[PDB]
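Holo prediction. Input below; ligand is potassium ion.
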Amino acid sequence: LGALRRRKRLLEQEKSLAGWALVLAGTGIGLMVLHAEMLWFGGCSWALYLFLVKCTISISTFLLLCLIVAFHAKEVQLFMTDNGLRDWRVALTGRQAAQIVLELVVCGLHPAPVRPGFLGQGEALLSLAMLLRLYLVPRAVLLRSGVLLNASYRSIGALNQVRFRHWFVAKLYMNTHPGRLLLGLTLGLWLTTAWVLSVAERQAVNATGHLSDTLWLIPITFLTIGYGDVVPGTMWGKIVCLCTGVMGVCCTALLVAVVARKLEFNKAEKHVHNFMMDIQYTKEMKESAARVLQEAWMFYKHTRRKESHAARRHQRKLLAAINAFRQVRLKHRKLREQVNSMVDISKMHMILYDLQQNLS
Amino acid sequence: LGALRRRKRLLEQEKSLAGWALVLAGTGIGLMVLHAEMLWFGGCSWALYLFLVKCTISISTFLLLCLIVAFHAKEVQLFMTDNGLRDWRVALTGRQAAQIVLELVVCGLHPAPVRPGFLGQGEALLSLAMLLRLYLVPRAVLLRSGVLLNASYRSIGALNQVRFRHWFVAKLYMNTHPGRLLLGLTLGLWLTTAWVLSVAERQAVNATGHLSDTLWLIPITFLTIGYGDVVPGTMWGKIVCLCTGVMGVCCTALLVAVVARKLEFNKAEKHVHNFMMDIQYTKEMKESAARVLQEAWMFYKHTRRKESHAARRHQRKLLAAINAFRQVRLKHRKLREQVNSMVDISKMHMILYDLQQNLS
Amino acid sequence: LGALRRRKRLLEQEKSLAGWALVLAGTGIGLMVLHAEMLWFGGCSWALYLFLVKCTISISTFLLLCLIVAFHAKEVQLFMTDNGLRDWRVALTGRQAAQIVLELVVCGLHPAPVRPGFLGQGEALLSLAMLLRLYLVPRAVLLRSGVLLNASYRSIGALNQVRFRHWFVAKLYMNTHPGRLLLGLTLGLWLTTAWVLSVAERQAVNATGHLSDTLWLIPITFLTIGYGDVVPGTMWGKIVCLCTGVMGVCCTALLVAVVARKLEFNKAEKHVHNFMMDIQYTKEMKESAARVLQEAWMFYKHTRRKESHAARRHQRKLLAAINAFRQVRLKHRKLREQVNSMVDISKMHMILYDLQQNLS
Amino acid sequence: LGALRRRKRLLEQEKSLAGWALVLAGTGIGLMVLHAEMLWFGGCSWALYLFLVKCTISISTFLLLCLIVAFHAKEVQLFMTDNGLRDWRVALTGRQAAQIVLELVVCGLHPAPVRPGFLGQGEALLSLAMLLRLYLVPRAVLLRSGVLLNASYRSIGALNQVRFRHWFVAKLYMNTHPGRLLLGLTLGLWLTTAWVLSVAERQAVNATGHLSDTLWLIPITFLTIGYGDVVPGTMWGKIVCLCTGVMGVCCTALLVAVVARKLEFNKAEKHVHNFMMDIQYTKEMKESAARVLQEAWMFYKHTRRKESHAARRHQRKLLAAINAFRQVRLKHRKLREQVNSMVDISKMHMILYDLQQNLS
Amino acid sequence: QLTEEQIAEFKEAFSLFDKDGDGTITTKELGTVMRSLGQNPTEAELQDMINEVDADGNGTIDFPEFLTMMARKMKDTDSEEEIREAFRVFDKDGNGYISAAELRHVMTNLGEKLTDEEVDEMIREADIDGDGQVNYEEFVQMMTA
Amino acid sequence: QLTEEQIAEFKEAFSLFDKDGDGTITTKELGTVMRSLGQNPTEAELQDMINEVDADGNGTIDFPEFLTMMARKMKDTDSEEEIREAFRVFDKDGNGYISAAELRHVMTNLGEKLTDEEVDEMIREADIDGDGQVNYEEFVQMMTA
Amino acid sequence: QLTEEQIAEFKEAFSLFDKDGDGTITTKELGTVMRSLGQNPTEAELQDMINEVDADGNGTIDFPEFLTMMARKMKDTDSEEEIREAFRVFDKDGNGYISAAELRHVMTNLGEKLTDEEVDEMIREADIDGDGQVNYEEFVQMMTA
Amino acid sequence: QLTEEQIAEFKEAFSLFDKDGDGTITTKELGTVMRSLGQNPTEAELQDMINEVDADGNGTIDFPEFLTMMARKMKDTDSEEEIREAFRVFDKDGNGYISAAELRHVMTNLGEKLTDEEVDEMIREADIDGDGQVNYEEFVQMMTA
Ligand SMILES: [Ca+2]
Ligand SMILES: [Ca+2]
Ligand SMILES: [Ca+2]
Ligand SMILES: [Ca+2]
Ligand SMILES: [Ca+2]
Ligand SMILES: [Ca+2]
Ligand SMILES: [Ca+2]
Ligand SMILES: [Ca+2]
Ligand SMILES: [Ca+2]
Ligand SMILES: [Ca+2]
Ligand SMILES: [Ca+2]
Ligand SMILES: [Ca+2]
Ligand SMILES: [K+]
Ligand SMILES: [K+]
Ligand SMILES: [K+]
Ligand SMILES: [K+]
Ligand SMILES: [K+]
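Structure of the complex:
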């Protein structure tokens, strides 16, 4: 022990630091949209504003950069706890020191306040570069699920050599409730791209290209219909429309397999259906075989009475009834073969149990 | 006895109240299209015949609200009969008494006859709200299936712990005749969604947007072709065209899933094909192994005679006959391996029977 | 037997009558394409050569109606022979007497010579009704395949009770050579439809709508890549374009299924791959398990000499060599588990054979 | 021996001759695009620099025609080494002598210098015929892989009757890493086609139809969207657009199966999930079975005191606790049945091993 | 009270079980149906199932005691199975009696926290004749009333 | 009455079952073919399918009595199998004779309702042994007229 | 040093293996868990993985020596397993000692080339027993330090 | 004539079969590889394959007589297997000798129609032993020289 009590604390201090860096990284993204849609619908009149917003964005970025490094220091503090070691100079590798720098560069791109309705060329990219802050979601999702500290769960995940990572939790969530997450992501991706493209192809002279003209263009491109009444006209608007088509094709590729798997009989329904479809065939065969002798005897009576116009009329009903009997016989034999072959995976246990009981 | 003779009566009284609440809904829906297409093609001239249809579609709702409540009151009696109760105050839950209000609200939306070819905005939604009356179909289908009172059928559905609900009957119907219902629904939706859109985008001056221009836009949107000659021009016409594409994609997925299996051999034909393909390979090998020795002997004879121009020619056919023999024997070996590897399906049963016949 | 020598004659007389009614139908179909695309490019000038094609068509139809009835009269003899009858009045059913009438009605629709580049409305339907003569293809194909008279083949098809019909032969042909038939039918259906639509939407004023404009519309509609530059403009041209898309979707589903089935490893290569990957993993593990000791000893030496700047450097390589060892260990364990699980379709056979050999 | 040392030399001399014919066949293609885009953007002004490129693309063909014949002169010497022969007149077949001529004809099509920004019709096909030189890629790839001379890989591939050829290597590469090759080919086919079509539909008057108007047309045709703002206008540009859609459909068909296969639980995690679900189900059942007795006792107390308003309220909770208990036990039974049925592949092995250890 | 048609239908449903035709169902005739339905039960559970409904006790089931079984398994939910099965989770130690420790553990620790004095009072009130061991009869009496 | 080519083809078909050139088919040679086709018969049905066609009875099948079998299984439908098998549904006990009980049950109750007197008269007319037990011979004679 | 909730959580985890409340984990119970997880081990491995953590040796595992096991299998990577598995690849004979030939082969031929004199010096330094046979104790001591 | 690298590569390929290290391959070491590759051979073929290549005869295969086997299985097509296997279709009695009837049937009836006199002359010419029974040695002598 000793190193087991200090692992339940340095890992809980990483659960309130990987979730509080998702609030200051959401507040920042929630202000660029406000600034853009206020500069568009406003202009140079609102000069007192459009400055406090940028100052708030800078403050939020500075408060996020002071949490990312704290989280990484806490993660470094776990290596020395796990592996018996005190000198911190060796617990720091040569790749983590570059991952930290990359994270700080990616999480530090904002339109700083260094000072009509158009954003520009530098701000229009420094704002759209704030959407890269979405890599913090899997970390917070993984650190919150209660499958990482449950001692009754790792004790079984270790006996089967199973490692707990993001993909395992993602697959578990997908298997629990598939349709909910699919619909949520599908309807949440049609509102972000519909603004990323609107900020790319908006114009003022024609008053066209805003959300009203993109919320219609994005879905028909996603579903690969493409009426062609509205089309992108800028080089930066022809790449989002190409990414959306690939996303739609991939979504269809995922959807087809799930749709195929969802509807199917299982063992219980199959066995019940097979058992209850046999009595109907057993009754139909008896009815068909009873519908043959009646005509075979009536024809004999009529040919002994020499009607010469009803014997030749009843000689067709016999020939049709024989065929009707044959069809039912073949269907019954096919169903019998299926039921005697479908139940062939559980009979092995019974056979080997009877053999073991015999012990001959 | 006692509580079994009443379940055959209180449940048959729910079979004649689930179809007479569907006839009076079909009539109410059918006397709406007539009113709409008579107001459109007519006008203020027929102001006397539009005060009778709007009264019939209001009298045919008081004969539906008096049947829904009767059906819901014939089920509390079933609950009391089942769970040994006499006081009705305990058999009424807090959700059965809340869904009745929702049912009576949904089944009570009609263009009341409270007294210009365009329907007003207050009536164009009340009319299209009548289509919500289509939730009464699964109830009537289930209550009339005939597998809910069969004492020889539940006696086997209980030994396997199988519950009889809408999904089970739907799966049974799908498995019986798949294509019929698929084509029926596919061709029955293209006549309803081609009117829900023509009531939404019809125009007066241009005389465009009626059924003649919506029976062509809906199929090419369902199939995701989308030429682009005719496109919706209203916000309410751009939602139906989006709901149609998703249905088209889903129907395509179901079609792929159904078709993926129908083209495979049944187990009966595979064995016959394998047995009858082996004699051909044996004959081919026996013929090919005779096109080696003949040329070998002929080349030997020509070398003995030393023609020096035909021995070299016949040394070129031996090396190709050997190659042909190699191909034939490789194909035969592969087919033999496939035949001897498919026995794993049922050879285990035969070997177990042979071992049990001698274990004594 | 005397009733077996006549089945080889009455069935060979149905092989030269079901194939000679397929050439007098091809000739009939190939003489409307002339009477249409010579009336179009010609006119009233060639009024003498249009009175000969329309008579040759009638002669061919009369020579085809005299073969259909002969074929249908050569089968009543087979029915009488099989069941041992002499009175033909009983061998004729009530449905075979209507099938013949339907066949003679369908195979008797031609533009008779009962007497301006546009075909009349009452004549362009008689001309296009000739394409219904394509139901004679399966009949002429089934009777020609050598699986109907092979006494060595029905002998084995009767011990498994398989029936030789139009579907078994089609499945056999599909399995023997899938791709060539698929491409042939795909490219043969793009030349008949392109003429059926061209005869439907052709016009003279604009000189548009002929094969040059319908050889481009049909493929992009089939592939659901509808651009919108050329679109049908008539009610009879808007049904062919809807019929093409359904076949396109069905062919896409069939292609998806075939592609899914085609590409995969078989057992003979899977076993070789596993066996030759195990050796590589064994070598990699042994290579990796030496650096751990090498840097361990080197760090021990350096801390013995107390460098204080190389010991801390070599303590950083041991912790990575251990991880590299762990990765290879896990990969080798996973491959070993797969190998132990992949060989389970013949392991049971081998162990059961060993047990049977041990017994008795 | 003797003929084994010469097979490792005559086959290495075909590894530096099948790769040095891929450099002179790449230079001749790279100096074609330069000539085309220099004649287009240039004209008659650069009449001196166009007499050097067209001579280099003719000197670089004489160094490929002298390598193809050398490779085909080293293979005829492997034949005589394998099969004991001395006269080369018999080792040369009648089809290799035509394959060599076909290869020399295909690899000898260049715009020779036999002497206005448009390429002539006699050169626009000779240039585009250079792309047929891409059949040399599989030949160079096969001889470079280290599976043709590894004596440890053809000794386990001969005990199982496996031929290496070109398809086994392709399947191995596909299975080793599917995604990277798929994306590489997908993005490499969107740049060659975008030039093949641009050289086909370019025009000078409108300054349209170049790479900028094809890099947008090709992807939306490949993805079967087809907006319709830009469409081909020449017969030679309407065939490339038809060829692209077929490859798009084929790529989708390849993608759907891989997407379906990639995501799934393995055998290691299904057992862990099943083992960790039943504990939760047992806890839920034991918790739910305690909300029945509590209400059954509280209602008993309240009817003992005869509240007459709380007994009829506690009798409404027992009937719901029983239903919840039923749901929980049904779910637990279903999961237990799945667990007892899922373990049936190694269960048979375990039972048979136990029987062997017991009795043999 | 049953209509003749219902009696005929139940007699037809009985023929699915008494395939031999003697008129009674034994352990060897229900086992065949259970095996043909995919299940693999054995002698203990077969005997328990047959003894559950046998109102007299002979190892066989007749029509009058089969109508009683069918009068319970055709309703929407059986309220006797969920009281006979909500009793085996309280009885962890299989003996047929409810110990004080088992009840004091399941009722108090799990679900709503119940007072120990209240649990003891309920156990004393519903106990089998002062033995402190609640049986199935007392359980059913208390939970039905 | 067959031609030379037909005789050669039938000999080739015989060679599939004969395997070794002894000239007769035994129960151990047809069983191998049936196992190769996937079926798993036993000796009882193996002998039942062989004694059906043996015109004299030796336990083996020869070419002259194989041509008789193959002159019946080549037609689109053989009218003898659905008369031999539409007779075992009238034979529930399996003794081999049609007693009055089975006929009076199946003919009257099932299918078109038939008068009891008419059924008795038909049974009396069909019966030729006079013992009140309709056999296969009388059944086949009545259905072939 | 643990709090009052981790003790309860680890007791709940222990109750998964100790199905009956005897208080110790035996070979049979662990084998049943292993089989329920889908694997099929046997007595040799079952006894091999139990004496690894048993601090005194009884054939059974207690709770104080279960906490020691759980203190290792919950960290990101156990470093006492990659020194016990990276030792059995240097011991091909299986006697339990590192022979001079085994080391001189694996260290020099594979990986980075090492001088024979350096390998001999390393073996002499690591051999605390002086018998020229490196054992697990000396190997672990040298590689941990 | 082989170089050092080729000899080393062949020695590495030898260790795939000779797992122990004694220096020879037995019928039980190749059987393990065959089973691991999915095949299920038995002692008959396991001895036949070894006897095919063993140039001295001891039941074991050595490296010098393994190089001889490997010199044939690395070329594109082995011309000895296709003459050894194109001989067992001319020998249906399994006695190792070509009977006159076998050849007169296979050569004349099938393939190109060969004269009976020509077949007899060829048989007489190839019958070096003079017993009228062509053997493997004469067959190989006729098909290669
Ligand atoms: Ca009975
Ligand atoms: Ca009884
Ligand atoms: Ca107890
Ligand atoms: Ca025989
Ligand atoms: Ca005989
Ligand atoms: Ca009888
Ligand atoms: Ca224990
Ligand atoms: Ca202990
Ligand atoms: Ca050693
Ligand atoms: Ca050895
Ligand atoms: Ca030897
Ligand atoms: Ca012979
Ligand atoms: K489009
Ligand atoms: K379009
Ligand atoms: K698809
Ligand atoms: K599309
Ligand atoms: K499209």
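Residues F 18, 20, 22, 24-26, 29 surround calcium ion (ligand 4) (CB under 6 Å). That is the main takeaway for now.
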